[PDB]
């Protein structure tokens, strides 16, 4: 049964869902998208804000 | 023949419950990393001595 134990993250068992999802997450883009919520607020931290966006 | 324990010269001083890893010549030698582990000794030994301990 043993030859190296290249876990996966789901191996994980008391991993969260969204800490899953950050450690299987390659760019600091996508944590944001996963971490940041409002699309306002997730809009100005990408410094890409529409007028809707900046109204908002 | 599938055996759940076996009888390996010691590298070194080796304790009860060590867990073990390959050393030197192909010697039982206590370790702490996982992924070196091949089994945890049952008995205690000294260095040319065999230990006695489960695979898992």
Do not use: H, M
């Given at each position: 049964?043993?030859?190296?134990?290249?876990?996966?993250?789901?191996?994980?068992?008391?991993?969260?869902?969204t800490?899953?999802?950050?450690?299987?997450?390659?760019?600091?883009?996508?944590?944001?998208?996963?971490?940041?919520?409002?699309?306002?607020?997730?809009?100005?931290?990408?410094?890409?804000?529409?007028?809707?966006?900046?109204?908002? | 023949?599938?055996?759940?324990?076996?009888?390996?010269?010691?590298?070194?001083?080796i304790?009860?419950g060590?867990?073990?890893?390959?050393?030197?010549?192909?010697?039982?030698?206590?370790?702490?990393?996982?992924?070196?582990v091949?089994?945890?000794?049952?008995?205690?030994?000294?260095?040319?001595?065999?230990?006695?301990?489960?695979?898992?």
């Amino acid at each position: 049964r043993s030859k190296e134990i290249s876990i996966e993250v789901e191996d994980i068992k008391d991993a969260g869902d969204t800490g899953k999802r950050l450690l299987k997450i390659n760019t600091p883009s996508g944590a944001r998208n996963i971490i940041i919520e409002n699309e306002d607020a997730k809009a100005l931290i990408n410094g890409e804000t529409t007028n809707t966006n900046k109204k908002n | 023949y599938p055996l759940a324990a076996w009888q390996v010269i010691a590298g070194s001083d080796i304790k009860v419950g060590d867990n073990l890893t390959t050393g030197k010549d192909g010697t039982a030698v206590p370790t702490d990393d996982p992924s070196t582990v091949f089994g945890y000794a049952v008995e205690e030994a000294q260095e040319g001595q065999l230990v006695t301990l489960v695979i898992s």
